[PDB]
Amino acid sequence: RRFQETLDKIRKEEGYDFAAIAFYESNKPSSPIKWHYVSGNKNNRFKLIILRKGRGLAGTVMKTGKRMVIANVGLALGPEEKIDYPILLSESLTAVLAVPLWYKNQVYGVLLFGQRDGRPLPKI
Numbered sequence: 001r002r003f004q005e006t007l008d009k010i011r012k013e014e015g016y017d018f019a020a021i022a023f024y025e026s027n028k029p030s031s032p033i034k035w036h037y038v039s040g041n042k043n044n045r046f047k048l049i050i051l052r053k054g055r056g057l058a059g060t061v062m063k064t065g066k067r068m069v070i071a072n073v074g075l076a077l078g079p080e081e082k083i084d085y086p087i088l089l090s091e092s093l094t095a096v097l098a099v100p101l102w103y104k105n106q107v108y109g110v111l112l113f114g115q116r117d118g119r120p121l122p123k124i
C-alpha cells in the first residue's frame with residue numbers, strides 16, 4: 001500500500017534501522033492508539049502495544065503535537081522506565097525520533113524512526 005511503500009522508502013533513504021506509524025485503532029471516543037505500520041521490525045510484538053492518549057511514544061507526540069527525540073535511550077531512561085515507551089523494548093531501540101503527522105492542522109498519526117545497537121541518529 002501507499003503508507004507501507006512510503007514508510008520503507010523514507011526509512012531506507014534516511015539511514016534508519018526501524019520505522020513505524022501509529023494511529024487511533026477506531027472512531028470510538030476512548031479508542032486506543034496502536035502501531036499500525038512497521039518497517040525493519042524484528043518481530044510482530046509491536047501489535048501487543050495498546051496506548052491510551054498521552055501514553056507511550058505515540059500517545060505523547062499525539063497529545064502535544066511536538067516531536068520527541070531520544071539520542072541515547074540508555075542515558076535518557078532507566079532500564080525499568082522503558083515500559084512507558086514499549087516500542088523501545090519490543091524493537092530494542094537505542095535512539096529514536098518521533099514526529100507528528102498532520103492533516104489540516106490536526107495530528108492524525110505519529111511517525112517514528114529508530115536505531116538499534118548504538119547506531120547514532122542521522123541529522124534530524
Ligand SMILES: [Cl-]
Binds near residue numbers: 056057084085087088
Ligand atoms: Cl510506544
